[PDB]
């Protein structure tokens, strides 16, 4: 069968309730219970029974229409029908409140924390990438400083190599 | 008798002539030895003079200066090998010892006024080498005039 | 004549002796002053 | 704004029973003062109901042929007095007071108390749940406002020096740790200048020694040369010029 | 033997005349020897003072001592002109007299 | 409310039933034609007039049933349960949104404060307390001096070596020249004052370091 | 029987379904009472219209009470049946259906994972500051290295200019100059020794 | 007979002449053996005596009391000194610093012996005072010779420079082999080398400390060539084996 709307189900079952109620209130039972007055004028008893039935049925219809009016029942039921028809794919029971707000809110607030973690990871990765180049520059500078110090030491040793010749000359020009 | 006296006289005359001519030959021998000694003295002195002249000629040739003695007790110095156009140009000056036992220059070639400027200094210092070096320098300067 | 010549020679030798005697005290006192100064 | 609750409709008046034909029956209890004991109030109300019934029946059957109305009133008064005595006796024996005692119908109750216990458990659980919800809301809002206020007080120029332990977890920890000294190099530069100056002094001394050396050598050469010259000169006369000039 | 003694007397007086001629020849030889002796003295006296003193004056002026036993055309010797004596080693076969004299005089000290 | 406050329904019903025959006793004097109907109508009237002024457990007689249910407590408990259901449902629907908004605000504030974190690391100050510029200039001047001196020394020393060699050569030909015959011939040869003056007075080499005064004229 | 809280249905509709069911009950019973009372008033006024009404109000009220009890029982049964119909069909939310507001609750998230995520976020926050401080220290090190290199270059050009100055005054190489000077000094010492020996020999002889 | 007697007298006179000439030669030889003292006596007189110390740069003039008239026969050892004079003949304008230092020190000693005006009154104590002075003179001259030697051969011992201020003496040692350069200041006195020298060190370059210098100084004996020995020991201890690195 097709998916029947909730408001139409409500209307049909209310009408069925009215029908079985008026069936329960039969005219023969009505006159049996009111046999005292019925012995005087059965006809006016018949029209007053008909008036009772019509008035009660009209009152029930007015009540259901009214309650649908202020309760906003039709729109809510239609929205619920849309929700159930869009989500009919799921067969397993749907999630329900756990009773503890923390685990209920964990699902809500997880994705944004995940996004923040991802952004922070990107930032720290970029900083590490920059720091790698910085460390490479530090190493190059250290190597250059070492080389310059070695060159200075070479100049110092080249200038200090004159000592052997100077001492040889002193040996040549010896004291008496 | 008389003949005996005559023969005795001739015998006396004999040995007197013999003795006198013998001493003549003795003096001849002495004269020969004297002339030999004189000749060998001449030869020795001549050889010594030749050696001295060789030395003096070497000095004069190498230095160019010529030192000679002339009358009036003057010592003449001749400088050559100075003027490049002719090295034989004689640049002469005469030095002589005066009465006061002092050297003094007599003249020059040509008439140069730098006569005394060296003679007082050579009188005092008695340095002939520097004296003549200065004289040669003065002559060289005179040449280029 | 010989006696006179010998007398003249003796006089000259005596004068030389006097000169040398005068010149002796020079070095004698010289040396003994060096002795006194050195000790 | 408007959404119906069950409490919102309890205040609304309902009618669970038919209105009686008779009027003023409710005022019978109003006419009875509450100063009397509740048993006496019951007796007075029952007597008032009896008189009301008598006075209602008095004119209802007047149309019937023959109606002993005077004897009806006489018997009504006599039976009202007797009924007042009867109510007093029922008050004395205590059975009239039994209307103020409740029975024990537990046979129909036990399920109802079970349901009430379930409701009590549910409402307690839900009260704890809403309390926890309110606590979470206040915690989060207070955290947010505290962070915002602290940030507002922040954003000034608060320079913070970095302690070495901050670099302990750094990726380039080895590079930072292996940093060479740099002032020692600057001191070694001055040391190098000092040693160059010392070498310079040595060079000057060597040059001075060499200078004195060849100076001494030249002096020795000149002395030996003049000695040789004098040795050569010693043979000659003091002045060849005088001897040469004096020749005649 | 009057005549014999007379003829012998003539012979020996003749012998006297020849030996007297020999004596006068000896006397002229004596004059000859005296003149050579005076010539020797005059020569030697002139030569030695003159030559020796001229050479010594040359050397004093030049302060140069020659090597006489060297090969010809080869200036060799010692110059005392400079403060330190230096050996003169020239070659006249390749150098002019002008240059040689100028160089030798250059080495002489001109200071008074 | 002046109505009688009762608690028992069964007791009121049974005591009214017991009081019933007191009203029923009136029927003896009623005529036979109207004995039962009028009497039963009066009995019903009495029951109605005595029942409408009875309140059971704080409720009306017809509203409170025969059972002993605590009607007021049941009603208030049910109302409380429904109200707490509605309240907790509204809380579940509403609170997560505000929670998420506060979380977003806190996250953004934390991101901003992390961005604004500025660490400062001043490099260590390297000291130049000895400035070697005058030292370098002095070293350059001295090095120039000694370079000049060494150049002069290397230029002068060979000259002195040559002069010494020439002088030694002079010394070695001096005797052989002196042996030459030509050379040999050419170069053939008051107050009493004890003075107390000794001999051996000469210009000693130490006079170089001890110049005497020239009488200070 | 256990009473269903129906918290999820109440969260959807905004009200407990039992509330609206009982309000419908009270409205229906009130309307039934009103119409039946109106019919009773009509029948009593009709009885009052006819003369000598033998139908007493008590009798008609008893009949109406009986007929009211008739409807009351039948209405109670049928109304209970239709309330169960509502609670099973209309007001019931299928267990496989989730509200749009709960769309974020479709995927579960364990508390342990959330705690791990919080710890990871805190650790990353620490690491960011650590890397920033490291970068600052590295910049300081680069500046210090630049300063040191400048000083080293100054010293090296000082040596270069010193060597150029030495070269400009003849001696472009000190070592070879010293070696040549030593050799020449030895030669001159030999010459001086020879000269002294010859001079001494001339002095003695 | 008279001629023979005169000839005998002449022979005796000639023998006496030869004897006194031989005595003269012996006396002159004894002088030449003993002419090797520190002081030189240029002039003596009956009133004044003159001594010249080292290389005639110092004059010692002794002035005696006038000889008593009529008594020249008294002992020469009893002559009274009236004025003792010291003078310096050094040309300070061209004198090297060593010469000036020597003269300064010896005149410092003279002023220390200012009492010599009253101590030396007779000729007995003159030779003793002469020895006392001459010893110090010899020591000071030896010190000056050491100074000149070190000014000549200083760089052989790494002693680059010597500066002569007042009695302080600054020895500048420098050597790049040990990276040590310092100036040692020595307080010289007229009592050199017997009196230890109060040295001080200024460390221009290197870590050379006072203790090493003091130990080296105490090691060197207090005798002649003290300064030269100190220089040699310093070079040996600090630079002898250090310079061996080639």
Numbering used by the authors:
A (entry chain P): 29 to 204
B (entry chain G): 80 to 224
C (entry chain Z): 183 to 221
D (entry chain D): 93 to 340
E (entry chain F): 86 to 197
F (entry chain N): 35 to 223, 250 to 277
G (entry chain M): 1 to 205
H (entry chain K): 2097 to 2342
Q: What is the paper's account of this structure, in its own sentences?
A:
We subjected the reconstituted KMN network to cryo-EM analysis and obtained a 3.0-Å-resolution reconstruction of the KMN network junction (KMNJunction) containing complete MIS12C, Spc24–Spc25 and all folded domains of KNL1C. At the core of the KMNJunction complex is MIS12C, which comprises a tetrameric coiled coil connected to two head domains (MIS12CHead-1 and MIS12CHead-2). A salient feature of KMNJunction is the coiled coils of Spc24–Spc25 and Knl1–ZWINT that run perfectly parallel to one another, giving the entire assembly a prong-like shape. The Spc24–Spc25RWD and Knl1RWD domains are rigidly docked onto the top of the MIS12C stalk, and their interactions with MIS12C are further stabilized by extensive peptide interactions with the C termini of the MIS12C subunits Dsn1 and Nsl1. Knl1RWD-C rigidly docks and recognizes a shallow surface formed by the Dsn1 and Pmf1 coiled coils, whereas Knl1RWD-N uses a canonical RWD protein-interaction groove to bind the otherwise disordered Nsl1 C-terminal tail. Overall, Nsl1 uses two highly conserved motifs at its C terminus to bind to the Knl1–ZWINT complex: a YPLR motif binds to Knl1RWD-N, and a VLKRK motif binds across the Knl1–ZWINT coiled coil. In our reconstruction, MIS12CHead-2 directly contacts MIS12CHead-1, resulting in an auto-inhibited MIS12C state. This state is stabilized by the Dsn1N auto-inhibitory segment (residues 93–113), which forms two contacts with MIS12CHead-1: (1) a linchpin formed by the WRR motif (residues 96–98) of Dsn1N, which locks into the hydrophobic pocket at the Mis12–Pmf1 interface and connects Mis12–Pmf1 to the coiled-coil connector-α3 helices of Dsn1–Nsl1; and (2) a zipper-like interaction of the RKSL motif (residues 107–110) that bridges MIS12CHead-1 and MIS12CHead-2 through both electrostatic and non-polar interactions.
Faithful chromosome segregation requires robust, load-bearing attachments of chromosomes to the mitotic spindle, a function accomplished by large macromolecular complexes termed kinetochores. In most eukaryotes, the constitutive centromere-associated network (CCAN) complex of the inner kinetochore recruits to centromeres the ten-subunit outer kinetochore KMN network that comprises the KNL1C, MIS12C and NDC80C complexes. The outer kinetochore is made up of the central and evolutionarily conserved ten-subunit KMN network complex, comprising the MIS12 (Mis12, Dsn1, Nsl1, Pmf1), NDC80 (Ndc80, Nuf2, Spc24, Spc25) and KNL1 (Knl1, ZWINT) complexes as well as auxiliary microtubule-associated components, such as the SKA complex, that vary between species.
